[PDB]
A paper describes a structure:
Functional studies have revealed that the in-vitro-loading activity of Scc2–Scc4 resides in the C terminus of Scc2, in contrast, Scc4 is likely a chromatin adaptor for targeting cohesin in vivo.
The 130 kDa structure of Ashyba gossypii Scc2378–1,479 was determined experimentally to 2.9 Å resolution by multiple isomorphous replacement with anomalous scattering. The Scc2 structure consists of an N-terminal globular domain (GD1) connected to 14 contiguous HEAT repeats forming an elongated structure resembling a ‘hook'. The 15th and 16th repeats form part of an oval-shape globular domain (GD2) with an extended loop folded back to the domain body connecting the capping helix at the extreme C terminus. Analysis of the atomic structure shows there are a number of loops between adjacent HEAT repeats with high crystallographic temperature factors. In addition, normal mode analyses of the structure suggest a pincer-like opening and closing of the HEAT repeats around these loops.
Residue numbers in the entry: 423 to 538, 544 to 570, 577 to 629, 637 to 652, 663 to 903, 913 to 948, 951 to 1037, 1041 to 1064, ...
Amino acid sequence: RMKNIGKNLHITHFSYIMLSILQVWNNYDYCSNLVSPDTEQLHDLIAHHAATQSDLEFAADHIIDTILKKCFSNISKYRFVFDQFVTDMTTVVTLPDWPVSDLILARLLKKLLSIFKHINIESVALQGIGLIGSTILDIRLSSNLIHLFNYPEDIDGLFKAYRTCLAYCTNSVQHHTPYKFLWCKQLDVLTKLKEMGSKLQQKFLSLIESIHAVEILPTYCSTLLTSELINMYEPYLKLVLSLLERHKVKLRSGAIRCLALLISKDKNMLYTPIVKETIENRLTDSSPLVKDAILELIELGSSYIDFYQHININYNDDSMLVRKHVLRMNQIIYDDTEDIIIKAYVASRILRRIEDEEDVIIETARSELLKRWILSIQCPNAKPELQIKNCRVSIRVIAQLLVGGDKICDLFEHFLIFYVLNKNAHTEDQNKLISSSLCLLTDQVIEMVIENEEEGRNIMKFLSVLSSCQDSFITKDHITALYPYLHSDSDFQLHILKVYRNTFEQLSHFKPKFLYDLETTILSRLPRMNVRELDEAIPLSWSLSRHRKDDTRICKACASCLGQLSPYIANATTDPRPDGKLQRLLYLATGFARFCSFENNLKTRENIFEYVTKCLLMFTENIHHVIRRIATKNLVKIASRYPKLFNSRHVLTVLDTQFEKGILDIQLVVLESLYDFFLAEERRSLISINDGICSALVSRYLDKILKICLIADLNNAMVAIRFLKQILTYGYTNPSLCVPTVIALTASPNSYMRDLSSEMFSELLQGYESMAFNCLNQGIRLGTEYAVKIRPKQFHEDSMFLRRLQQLMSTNKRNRSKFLKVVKKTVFSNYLSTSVNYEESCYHIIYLLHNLSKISYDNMLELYEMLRSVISVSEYFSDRISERLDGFNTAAEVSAIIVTRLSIEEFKRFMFEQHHLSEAKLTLLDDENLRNKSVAALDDQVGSLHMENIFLGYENPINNKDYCWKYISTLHR
C-alpha cells in the first residue's frame, strides 16, 4: 500500500499524509488579508511565523524520534520501514509539491549523525545517511544565505526563482497548501537574515504586496541552497571521512560506499581541501585493504595526476595487491600528464618493479614501458609527424629518468640490454618493430643534441647508454655530425667520448680525412684530460690508429708524454715533490701502456709497457705520499694487463711493502686494483687465462687480506671481504682458510658485513658442511676478539652471535650436538683454562658468557652439566683470589680474575632466574642424569646479563686498586 504521485512515484501513505498535515503550518492567510503596511503589525507577523516554525520543528523532531526509536528497538524486522522512510523523503525533496520535506530530512540527518550503539544500527544509519548526502549533492549540482548577507542584490533574484515554483504549483494536482507553505519559505529567508534594517523591510513589504517538470528542478533547487539541509553537507562530509579510521570494518566499508557515490557525481570533489587531506593521510597510515580502497576512490575521478606523489608512497608496499594497484595508476598518470618531470617520476617507479617477488608484476612493468617507449613509435595508426613527436617525449622522459640514481640507471640498462634487445623475449614481429623503433629513436636522439647546440647533457648520457649496446644504431653520418661538439666544452665530454669509443669499435670504413682531423683533435687534448675521460680517449686513439692503418701519430703523442717525465725520473734518482702535472702524466703514461700495443719511439730499445713500469717503480718510500699512491695504483693496473709482471721481484716487493706498512689509502688502492684483476680473470674463464699467477698471489697475500677483513676501517674491510668472496667462489684456496674469518664477520655490529657474512657462510655450509664444523672453533675465537675490538665499551649489546650460528648449523640429529660440543670445548679449552692470561681475555670471556646465555642447550642435562662446569671454574678462581689477599703491582691479575669470576657468577644467576632453576638438581649426580636428558629447552630475549654485578660501577676495573678493594670488602663483610 503506497500512494501515487505525478511521475510514477509512490510513497508510504504514512509519509504522504504526514507531509500534507505539516504543510498547513503556514502563515500566508495571515499575510494575504494583511493590506496596510503597519510597521507595527509586521514585527507582529514575525512572532507568529517564528511560532509556526519552532512548533513544526518540534513536531518534526518528535515524529523523527518515534520512528527511529521504533526502528532501532528491533533492528532485525523494521529494516525497510526505515529505508522506506528515507527513500520517501529523498524522493520528494526535489519537488515543489512537498516543500516541508527539506525540513524533515534536515532533522533526520541531524539525529543519524549523532549516532556516530550496536553495529547493526550504525551500519543501517550509515547507509541511509549516505543516501541523504547523495541527494544533498544532487540538489547542489542542479544549478547560500550567508552569501545573501554580503550581497543582498541576489535576494531579488532568489524570490524570482520562488515565483516560478509557485507558478508551477498552481497547475496540479491538489496544490493549495503546497503553494502556501512554499510561499512562506520566502518569508522564512528574511527572518533568518534579520537573525544575523529597512532594506529587508521594503523587500518584506513588496512581498506582501505581490499576493495581488524537469525544467523547474534546476530553479527550485536554487531556492533550496538557503535551507538548513544543504548547509549540513560539510559536517556530514567531515564525518564519513573520519569513519575511514574506525576499527570496525562495516563502518569503514560503509564510508567507502558513501564517498564512491559522491565522487562519481562530482569528480572535482577529490581536490576539495577536506577530502584531499584525509585521502593523503590514509595512504600513509593504514592497512593494505584500506590503502587499496582509497586508491580505488581516487580512480573514480577523471584525472588524478596531482595525487601522483602520494600514490607512490606504496609503490613498494608489502602487499602484492597494493603494488599491482599503484603500477596500474602510474600507467594512467603517465598517459595523462604532458609534464616530463611527472612522467619520469612515475616511470621510475614502474621501472623499479621489474625487480619484484611476483613474476606477474615484472612482466606488467616491463611490457608497459616497452609499449610506451619503443613499440609506440611505429603505431599502425600513422601519421609520421606525430610519430617523431612521441619519439621525442620518450627521449625527454628517459633522459630525465637517467638523471639521478645509480640504481635506476642500472635498472634501465638491464631493461634495455637483457629485455628490449633480447630477441628471445619477444615475437618475430615485435623484434622487427623494436629494431625499427630504436633505429628511428637513436637518430632523433642525435638530432636533439645538435639542435640543442639541463636537457641537452642528459640526452647525451642516454646516447652513451644506447652506444654501449651490442649493435647500436649510430652510424657514420651520426658520428660525423657530432664532431663539432667534441671540440666545444661538465660530463658532456666524457659521454661523447664514450659514444665515439664504442661506435669506432663497431663501425668501419670511415673517410680518411675525417679520421685524420679526429685523430688530431683527440691527441691534442689528451694532456688536459682527467683520468675517467683518458680511459675512453686512449682506447679511442688506438681504434683510430687501426682505422688509419697508421701508428706514427699515436706514437708521437706517446713519446711526447714519456719525454715530459724525464725531468721527474731524474729528480727521482735524487729526491725532494709533486703538484698537478705529474699526477695526470703518470695516468697518461700508464694509459698508453695498457691500451696500446705498439712495439719499438726514440730512447732505448724495449717494450713500452716494460719501460713504463720501470718509470713507475721509480715512484713506488722516499717519494711523496700522494704520488706513491697514484704510482702504486697504476703499477697494479699495468700488471693486470700483463700478468707476467706479477712474477717480477721488483713489483712483488712493492706489494709486500704496502701490505705490511699498513697505510690505509695505499693499501686500499692495491686491494681494489688486485680485486679488479681477479674479477677480470673470471670473465675470461667464461669465454687468456693465467691460474698459476693468481694462485701465486693468493698464497702470499691471503693471510694479510684475511686480516684486513677484521680491521676497524670499513673502507678497506669492505673491499677485502668482497675480494675474499671472489677468491672462494673461483676456488683458488681450500675453503677452510677463509671460514674462520667469515664466521668472525657474522659477529659484526655493522649491518652489511653481518648480512654478507651469513649468506657466504650459508653458501659454504651447503657446499662444505663437515669442513665448516672443523673451522667453528677458530671462527668463534676470531669472532669474539673482533666483536670486542670494534666496540670496546659496548660489545656486550649483541648476545646472539653464537645463536645465529647455531640456527645456521644445527639442522640435523648429529649437527645439533656437534655445535654444542665445539662451543663447550672452545669456552673451556681456550678461555677458562690455566694457559689463559685473564688480563688479555676477561672481556672476551664476558662477550662469550652473554652469547652462551642465548644459545639452546637442547636438553636440561647439557644445560645443567654446563653450570656444573662454570661453578667449578668459579670456585677455582675464588681459591686463587683467596691466595692473594692471604698475603696482602699485582692488582692487574687479581682484577682480571675478579672480573672473570663475577662474570661467571652473573651468568649462573641469570641462567637460574630465566630458566628454572634449582640448586637441588644441580648439586646431585648420577638415572637422575638421564632424567635430565629427556627434558627440553630453548631461549629468547628476555633481557641480558646485569653488568652492574660485574664491574661494580667501576670504569675500567682492570688494574684498579679501588675495584679490588670493593670486591674484598664484599668478602670479609
